[PDB]
Amino acid sequence: MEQCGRQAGGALCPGGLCCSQYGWCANTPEYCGSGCQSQCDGGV
């Protein structure tokens, strides 16, 4: 799992993954919902 956002110098997730409020990359509501830092729409 890649890191992102505040927790990784502002980095975007690879492969259209959502960056959670904790700075981890995945595509579940826990990552793409409230607090999502980037690519919250899956990179559409």
The three state secondary structure string of 1-39 is CCECEHHHCCECCHHHCEECCCCEEECCHHHHCCCCCEC
Q: Which of 31, 37, 30, 42 is nearest to 7 (CA)?
A: 37
At CA 44, angle to CA 27 and CA 4, rounded to 5?
A: 45
**The CATH number of the domain where 34 resides is what?**
3.30.60.10
Q: Which residues contact 34 (CB under 8 A, 6 or more apart)?
A: 21
If you search the block for the tokens 């904790």, which residue do you land on?
A: 22
Residue 1 corresponds to which tokens in the numbers above?
């799992």
What's the structural domain count of the chain? 1
Domain extent, residue 28, equals 1-44
Tokens 């830092």: give the residue: 37
